[PDB]
Amino acid sequence: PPGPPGPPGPPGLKGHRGFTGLQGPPGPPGPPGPPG
Amino acid sequence: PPGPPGPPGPPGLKGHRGFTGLQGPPGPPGPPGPPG
Amino acid sequence: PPGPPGPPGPPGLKGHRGFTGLQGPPGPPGPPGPPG
């Protein structure tokens, strides 16, 4: 009779790198200014 | 005759994590200073 | 004979989005205070 099914193929390719992260939030307000 | 072709291989590995996002903007200017 | 190897597996999934960026720095010192 015919032979058995062949073996599995190679593993798939690794996925592409993820999207770059979002930008972080703006920083806090600065310190109060110098005295007048 | 030869058996039929094998099945697809296993799925690929997941992609690498994306790069970390940009540092956030500087905060706004601080309050006016105290009176002279 | 056994069949030929199967085709490659499906691609891995896209990577995770990168981490969000750092919060930005504190803002600059505020303006000088009033004269009085």
Side-chain angles (χ1 to χ4, degrees):
Chain A
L13 295 175
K14 182 178 187 181
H16 282 99
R17 177 186 298 281
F19 294 125
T20 297
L22 304 183
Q23 183 174 30
Chain B
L13 297 161
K14 184 174 197 67
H16 198 261
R17 188 184 66 253
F19 296 115
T20 298
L22 296 165
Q23 178 169 205
Chain C
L13 300 188
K14 188 171 181 63
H16 293 127
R17 180 175 294 273
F19 302 127
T20 299
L22 272 51
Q23 179 179 98

